Design a protein around this ligand. Structure first.
Ligand SMILES: O=C(O)/C=C/c1ccccc1
Ligand SMILES: O=C(O)/C=C/c1ccccc1
Ligand SMILES: O=C(O)/C=C/c1ccccc1
Lengths: 641, 640, 637
């Protein structure tokens, strides 16, 4: 299952301490993300594996260039200018870098992406096709492990000459290039090199081109994008189960036979996960009891945001998993040109610098992320509306006084804003190819641009997941309070039926109403005669007077109402206050509920809780952003397959 | 390799004679396209029958005994809380409600018949509750070329359009039915003409007919068949582009792609290396770059050199999408799912067409990517600065003042590419909360499939144009080789006649070989054009090297003789050509097909046929499938 | 009379305003909003409209206390309006609590602009807010205090406005900036400016949040910038003509009179004036008089079709400015209190759709301006389309180690590509929102934000294009000087070698007619176009005069070309390292070269393309670019 594969990525992300870079061992997206996000993670460039290969290629290129071999961008001009020959080998390479230091700082790429790119460029060199000197690769390793990286302008690549030239610029000690050292220091490139015991390199044949002629920045951003897309995908799938529990869904939507006869792999696998999460759920028992009361006046099936979730998820799962493979292939490639086949004495002229595999798949993933967002939006919408939430209060407002408690209405508005922007972001970037660079680059991938937009889409999806999880924790509390309140109402009604000495017929009629009327429809003023509890009791009292048909019966029914009116509300208040100062204990989603309530320190939302919705959702968002959310996710899933 | 898979699709499309429908044998997109486009292809529903019967009997029996089953003893969609024992009238009321489209324009019969096949196929899995007799009727209608006229729009994926198939089966008079290409009659008359009687819907049968993905998936099936064929055509014609543009075939060298191993990158390059190995045009290319080598580009522009990298995601998208669409074709897309073996009806959402919808979005982006590749290649071909000796606009002339060549096609190619990029925005991002907020997610698959279909129509136009231009370029390259040999022989011959020294003779022949003929073809002895400029430059040099009055006498005589004979010899060879490298090329079948089989010729002011007339013939051959004959011929022997 | 004068008016107002008067009758323009955002010496002056404000606030408080039925005042909010209540203050406090729902994953300029716009809306006396709250807004604005606001959450501006309300009522969770440096909790911020936290009275929470202030604040600075940058682009089409050797006839008034889109007429009118008696158009005419019948009769579309292209873009930007200013000067609040007639009027003036749709349109028009710059830049970089200029505007002479502006050229494609992507619409993505109460909503802040991003990219493109054109000016001036040297050397060598007068004249024609940048790299190279032309002229002379003395002298001429030619060409170039002096674009060239301290780009100039373009970009961003723009346009109309 893809579920196992994603769990695999998460564990690798958590567990890795050293990234082996040797030209044969694969780098995964989890490794790239770990490097970027955990500074304890170090790069290990292995000499025994690949130094010999690199040195053979290096000396082949320098020897061949000095003897006047005709090789593009080595004894030849760049791009549209490859007709121009020259024997000024070093100055050809110097002139390239000067030409490409052409980005502009408005008011930049983050260090996470820049360090990831440096890693990917280093990896590309290990295949021994580039002609770069081993010593430069050692410098890249040292800069990575010492937290040194250049400040890079955001824009300029059609996919990654301009942004990579800033890495080259650091390596050759260009004084105009500014480098970070950790989080606090920044200094000119030459001073950065001296602080980590390096000297500026003088570029030899092909070395300038080797540094800049790759897909490292697009593929770097795409790598962290795809790691995040996997984690958030699994989180969304998992939380569809929690949604079923709180909304009072019918778990039959996940039955394996439904998906066996429409066997999209992502449909089968998401449904398999959901069935396991919901099997013998204590919340699904509450749902079953709810639909057994007044059965023929309630919906036979759930709305699509739940019932249709495996079908919806199918292409989204498949897109994210297929895109991960493609991105990792790019990570583990010689993306450079010319390709030096030193063994056969040939410089091979192609276009491995073309970022098209990444570019197209970034467009697809962004569409899939918008699909995940729409699912979340539709589920959240149902949850806020009492007509669609099967007993829950509008806006998940606890009240009891709803006139000063609008619950999660602000989050609901925000969810619409999030979905809307996300759907806009999902238009493609690859459809905007311009004929570029003196019409030499008449097709180009725009991969870094697309990756950056998919990254922005995932930021928004994070926000949407944080809100949805926060709302579902609120709904857990309201369902647990609901169960407790109905028991109080039944007890008061039963006891008072005895105290006032009503017949059995009457008593049982009244107890059915107490059981059947949704408690959140009258919690605000339980004895208000226009609200649904009294409305139901009154009609039951009229029927019982008709069925028994007297003055004594009426005396006692009148006494029942008075006694209700001095006792009911206080006992309902008491149980709610106790709750504020249990089905979730048997739910697979207990680790999420515990995480949010205890570890992040929150509570049921109400006018008596002074923390804003922002304060609560911020805590959840931060835990999603920094990876802490994977702990309850893995806890929730333990034992699965 | 995907190449062998696509060849397999094409062969299946051509060779199938009956589609076996039995609930276990897979239907492929080639089968669906065959059924749609070749009316001799018949459906054979193979009795599966026992399962279907057991299912219908269970449903009818349970409904009658008051079982609670959505859309069967329950209202539809957002109204599923309302129950009823009026089993037949519940089903008739659904069809009436869904006969809600408007004619503005309709879904074509090809799509409607494909949808009828896909609905029939869904029923074979024994999950739907429909009667076997209704399935037999669908088979008969399919084999008799009867289909309802269906409105284009109204599905968010396919209740409304499917209701017209149901309407035909129950003989609704307001439902108009096609029989073949012209006859249109009311549903009851159509049923009578093919020996059928209207059905009276029993429990669940209305819902069974309408509650699936057959229309979106039908359009998606022919969309994917075409995307596979057009993909292979584009990849193959990248090799023909290399031949006419004087490319360097090294871009397809396997080591380059081994070290960046995207499967579609490796597989496209593998095909291209094989296509270009031993090419006679690549011989001409190598000879071309050996002359003034240091004044000519070292490598090609991206539209060629980067083609395998560009093609890689396009290949992978089209192949993966094909698998997903076929999974849907071979599914029970219906609800509830009757699990009669376990005495249960299961409530889910297999009618949700999201797998198809999302993949139609991706394929449309990939198709836009193919169109951009074609546009870029075509652009280079039309511009003399980028075409390595070909005339601008591929204009033969010789009088270019009244011959603008393929400039009209060039303008059109920009219009095609531009529309195509617009079409490739996603449909799935426009999900509205629909049907009293019951359908708060919905796939829009039929809408998306329709837009991808529109994109592929434009792609066909671009392919037709590009192939037409490359046949022109083949002719221009063959005439170029013959014209230079004539120029060489005349210069060699006149050098002898005029008693020029060997230093002189060597210089003048170098010029004759080195100067691109299309730069002076319009007036070969014009002293301001490149041949004479070159000869005059070499004559000054020879006078200085040999330093006289006798040499000058002879050089003046050379210029005079050239001025009396050169034009006439160049004219005669061209006139003769208008009334050989390609014979050794793997693309010979394309050139032969376009030139001989479609009856075309080198384009010029002396050829009466318009660009329209020529490209129309190629487009028609792409659209009706005849183009696969030269394609399969071209690829014969690839990978054994 | 012209949109050009209207834009010059905006710029002057932006520069010159000292105080923004807020009074319920004097309009606020987009230049006023931008000036308050960007010039901290600009103060707000709330003019005590006091009477009508007080009348309105007392009407609302009294009516609410007496149990009048008013939405969001004695009833719940949005989808909850069925619920009535007499808990007047708590209702308003419950609203703010509910709306502090953003998350940190908006700049102070936008927040302060939004504060200005909310204050303005209140001056019309329709809102019920207390005068004292308005006084507080004025004080916060003038003291540079504003809340830190989350970027997202509005469908247009409840959530971001709630952070302004949270500041006013001293919510501890709300963080406030005071100037550029310090951040403190709201209560601390209020006390530092001598304010106390407000306790919201009837309608005040709603009044504070139920508006279009944020969408409209971002849109105001967007429209200010769009006007300035449009004029800059139009103006610089004239500079493009000068450097590319265009034919100025494309801007002739009759062409545009017979297709009279106002934007077409007015942009052509500017360009005609800019190009009249241009010293570069004089050079252009001389160029096309040499081998006239071998050169294009017309220019390519990026220049010749510029007025037709600009027409819709001018019109969209000017029309959108009007709409945005109408919104700035509106009571965007609900209910609207008609105190004179004792009615609270229930409508939807909080709906930002006028702004939202126009932000979509302007984003499309900005993408159009970008495409025009990209096309022009592309022409300039390609020797086949630049009428004599070197590829990539590379000075060389050694082109093998000078790729010129190739980096900037790649970046322009990247800029254009992203810009075209951004210009898809936001307003087509309306979701049914807020328990299906907001089943239509404008998304105006989101759209304004995307148009703002598009304008950031357009600034980069303009900075690049101006830098390239300054390079081109230098290359054109050097070109004229170099051709003079070649002519003089050829001329004197012809006399000195005793060549016939007709031979001399043919050789001098070659020197005038061959583009110098095709042989600057090695002028005596016998395969480059100078020597190719001279060789064919020398053979033609030999035939014409058909001797061993003539040939001796022609051979000496060729040889002695190596004595002096290259050294003289090198000398004039190094010395270079008057035509612009008489151009209307002199102020741009002088600004870029002298004021910003740059020079002709080459391998000998140590500064990178980044360093040069950064200077130009900064001047565009901070507004310094308007000084040379206004200088250039002095006297127009
Ligand atoms: O084709 C290549 O290998 C390199 C192209 C290029 C173009 C511009 C700058 C640098 C390299
Ligand atoms: O869920 C189903 O099985 C059917 C839903 C539906 C909705 C509208 C019309 C008909 C059927
Ligand atoms: O005027 C309306 O209909 C709604 C206003 C509003 C204010 C806050 C939250 C939601 C709605």
């Amino acid at each position: 299952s893809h579920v196992k594969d994603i769990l695999g990525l998460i564990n690798a992300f958590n567990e890795v301490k050293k990234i082996t870079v040797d030209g044969t061992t694969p780098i995964t997206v989890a490794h790239v993300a770990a490097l970027a996000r955990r500074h304890d993670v170090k790069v290990a460039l292995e000499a025994e594996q690949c130094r010999a290969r690199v040195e053979t290629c290096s000396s082949w290129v320098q020897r061949k260039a000095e003897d006047g071999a005709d090789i593009a961008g080595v004894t030849t001009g760049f791009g549209a200018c490859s007709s121009r020959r020259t024997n000024r080998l070093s100055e050809l390479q110097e002139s390239l870098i000067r030409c490409l230091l052409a980005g502009v700082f408005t008011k930049e790429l983050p260090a996470t992406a820049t360090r990831s790119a440096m890693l990917l460029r280093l990896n590309s060199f290990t295949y021994g096709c580039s002609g770069i000197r081993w010593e430069v690769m050692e410098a890249l390793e040292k800069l990575l492990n010492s937290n040194v990286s250049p400040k890079v302008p955001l824009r300029g690549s059609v996919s990654d000459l301009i942004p990579l030239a800033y890495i080259a610029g650091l390596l050759i000690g260009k004084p105009s290039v500014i480098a970070r050292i950790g989080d606090d220091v920044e200094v000119p490139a030459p001073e950065a090199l001296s602080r980590v015991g390096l000297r500026p390199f003088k570029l030899q044949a092909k070395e300038g081109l080797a540094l800049v002629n790759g897909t490292s920045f697009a593929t770097a951003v795409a790598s962290t994008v795809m790691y995040d897309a996997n984690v958030l995908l699994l989180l969304v799938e998992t939380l569809c189960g929690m949604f079923c529990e709180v909304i009072f869904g019918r778990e039959e939507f996940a039955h394996p036979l439904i998906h066996k006869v429409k066997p999209h792999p992502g449909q089968i696998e998401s449904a398999e996960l959901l069935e396991w999460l919901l099997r013998s759920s204590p919340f699904q028992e509450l749902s079953r009891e709810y639909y057994s009361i007044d059965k023929l006046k309630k919906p036979k099936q759930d709305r699509y945001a739940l019932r249709s979730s495996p079908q919806w998820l199918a292409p989204l799962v498949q897109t994210i998993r297929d895109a991960t493979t493609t991105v990792e292939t790019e990570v583990n490639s010689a993306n450079d040109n010319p390709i030096i086949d030193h063994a056969n004495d040939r410089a091979l002229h192609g276009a491995n610098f073309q970022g098209s595999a990444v570019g197209f798949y970034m467009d697809y993933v962004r569409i899939a992320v918008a699909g995940l967002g729409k699912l979340l939006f539709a589920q959240f919408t149902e949850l806020m509306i009492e007509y669609y939430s099967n007993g829950l209060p509008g806006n998940l407002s606890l009240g009891p006084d709803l006139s000063v408690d609008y619950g999660l209405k602000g989050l609901d508005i925000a969810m619409a804003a999030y979905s809307s922007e996300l759907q806009y972001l999902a238009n493609p970037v690859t459809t905007h190819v311009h004929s570029a660079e003196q019409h030499n680059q008449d097709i180009n991938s725009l991969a870094l641009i697309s990756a950056r937009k998919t990254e922005e889409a995932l930021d928004i999806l994070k926000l949407m997941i944080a809100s949805h999880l926060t709302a579902m924790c609120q709904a857990v509390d309201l369902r647990q309070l609901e169960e407790a309140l109905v028991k109080v109402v039944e007890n008061v009604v039963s006891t008072l039926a005895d105290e006032c000495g009503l017949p059995n017929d009457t008593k049982a009629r009244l107890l059915y109403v107490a059981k059947a009327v949704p408690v959140y429809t009258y919690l605000e003023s339980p004895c208000d005669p226009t609200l649904p509890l009294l409305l139901g009791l009154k009609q039951s009292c009229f029927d019982t007077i008709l069925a028994l048909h007297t003055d004594t019966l009426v005396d006692r029914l009148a006494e029942f109402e008075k006694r209700l009116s001095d006792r009911l509300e206080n006992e309902m208040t008491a149980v709610r206050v106790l709750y504020e100062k249990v089905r979730i204990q048997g739910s697979k989603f207990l680790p999420f509920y515990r995480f949010v309530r205890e570890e992040l320190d929150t509570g049921v939302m109400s006018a008596r809780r002074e923390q804003t919705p922002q304060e609560d959702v911020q805590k959840v968002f931060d835990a999603i952003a920094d990876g802490r959310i994977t702990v309850p996710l893995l806890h929730c899933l333990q034992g699965f397959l």
